[PDB]
Amino acid sequence: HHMILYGTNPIAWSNDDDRSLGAHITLDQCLDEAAKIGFDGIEKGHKFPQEAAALKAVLEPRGLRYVSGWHSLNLLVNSVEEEKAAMQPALDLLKAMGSKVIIVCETSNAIHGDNDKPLQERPVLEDARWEAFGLGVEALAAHAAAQGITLVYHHHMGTIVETEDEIDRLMRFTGPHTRLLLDTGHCLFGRGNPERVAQKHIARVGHIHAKNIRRDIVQDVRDQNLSFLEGVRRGVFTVPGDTEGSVDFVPVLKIAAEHGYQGWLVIEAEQDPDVRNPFEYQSLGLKSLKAFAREAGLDK
């Protein structure tokens, strides 16, 4: 029972939102390379089986645990009860796989999947609606906790939870069962400070995505008004240990260590697999992230 478990995400191989990126890379190549690199587990991708027996049939022979899966929320247009029914299939799969977390994100009005929409036109939730949105998220979180699953909210570019102020609003209007998924890459991309977010909310963090960014490319997205998927194809994201990145990982992991964080560190770095070889960059990500966690005192 290692306290800290290192996972990966299959979008470094095949992107979910833009199905042309890594379409040629089979599920088999993705999982073989993820296991060969040394990851303890992997998160859901769009090529994964969604039935317990079939999913174990591909994961267990490779020694990969099912970390979690992304689940889209539509609390801004659907009732809380309908959203509870929507996540139940995901909860069933996670329990059978032994997963302890469900990753969630409000995507009813999100634009990260719209290749033609500039990221600056992303949705902003009207101020008065935060309280009700929070009650809905926490209602889903209490529902999942009753079945042994912890809901972790994934702040994300192109959604209503993008900036550091909006992360603060979410945490303010949720609790006690709602946890935060701290994604370092999305936080900095959204002009936030990963270290400051961790200092504020580490007690509520239940899942960590160690995602890096190339500052050069992020500023290209801003200056030229590009879409999220345009930025992904240009290399807006990369892995821990890449000298082209700008995220400072040790301070964040040090805050986690000081509060006794237990759970997953996941390297999630979508890139164009033709240009940024997934085996190479995910290999560099795992090596570098373990070194950072050792330096931070997080992994003893």
Ligand SMILES: [Mn+2]
């Ligand atoms: Mn993420």
